[PDB]
Amino acid sequence: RYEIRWRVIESISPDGHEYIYVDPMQLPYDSRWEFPRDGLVLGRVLGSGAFGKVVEGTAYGLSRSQPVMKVAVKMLKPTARSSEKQALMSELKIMTHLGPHLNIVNLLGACTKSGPIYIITEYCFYGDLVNYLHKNRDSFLSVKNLLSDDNSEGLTLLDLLSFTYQVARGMEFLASKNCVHRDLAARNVLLAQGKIVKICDFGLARDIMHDSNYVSKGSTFLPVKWMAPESIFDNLYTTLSDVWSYGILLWEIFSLGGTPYPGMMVDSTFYNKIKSGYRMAKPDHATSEVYEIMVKCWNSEPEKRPSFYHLSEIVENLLPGQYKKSYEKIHLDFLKSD
């Protein structure tokens, strides 16, 4: 019945107390985005939620670079409320505002006139990261070119470092735009062709009510296992809090899809342990260096945590130099599209 909104920060008071977030309705939609309905063909349903669904699709003429293009389409169910339509429009405005990045699922086009609203997004071949890791759990054994391509081989530490680097980059981009994700987790990361990490959100395509990851508090659902202490207790959300989420996410990556705080249910006892300063032990496939990154992200003092930009730098040093070169070419190819 809900989704967690990405918040973009318009301004912060000199004291550091009053935060003003942009109002999506206030922002302006760009008509250039509009794509003719006839030019879009809808396929199989990628996901289904009580109020919405994601569908496979092909867009014709949408892109000069890819005249026939595989894509994913976001649409509301008839069940969706009048207010919810607003949410889709809001998503369009915010996404246009942020602009495009290689590491986030991107908005390609939208159909908003004389029809059910349709959001066109990049199509990711591998699906969500959690499922992908589980699928490749077995056959995983502890060159750089192979990593940034579709060649299939047993999953490697190198692959994990790549996913680790891409999420940092995607997050760095979001932070630069003063955008706070508030629900960063492997479930919200999808993998595209070429093993390119794309960051997304839980959405209306799947049911938050039916997901164990979220605890419902008040009128909202919270991914407590991924929340920074300030968020849980002080209800404060920032780029720094996201960093905490990034560390939890890394734990998910190095445990091959493992649930954080395994064997621990979220309860009063869990909250107390976090206040105590309790942190997760090293994951099985995590190197000492990677675990160190997770621990830094989990610092009690948010200002103490590393910036996403710093994290990208740290991860890069743990990757062969050719990986960085490959990322750069892919980044440039991505910005050259169309």
Ligand SMILES: CC1(COc2ccc3c(c2)ncn3-c2ccc3cccc(N4CCC(N)CC4)c3n2)COC1
């Ligand atoms: C043929 C396969 C194809 O799978 C897929 C799945 C989702 C795919 C996809 C290919 N391209 C894109 N998206 C998207 C895109 C935006 C999303 C925005 C919010 C939420 C999403 N999701 C992610 C998947 C989840 N099961 C439902 C909600 C989104 N998904 C099966 O994996 C390969």
Ligand SMILES: [Cl-]
């Ligand atoms: Cl959003």
Ligand SMILES: [Cl-]
């Ligand atoms: Cl096909």
Ligand SMILES: [Cl-]
């Ligand atoms: Cl583990």
Ligand SMILES: [Cl-]
């Ligand atoms: Cl080690």
Ligand SMILES: [Cl-]
């Ligand atoms: Cl820093």
Ligand SMILES: [Cl-]
């Ligand atoms: Cl940051």
Ligand SMILES: [Cl-]
């Ligand atoms: Cl960088």
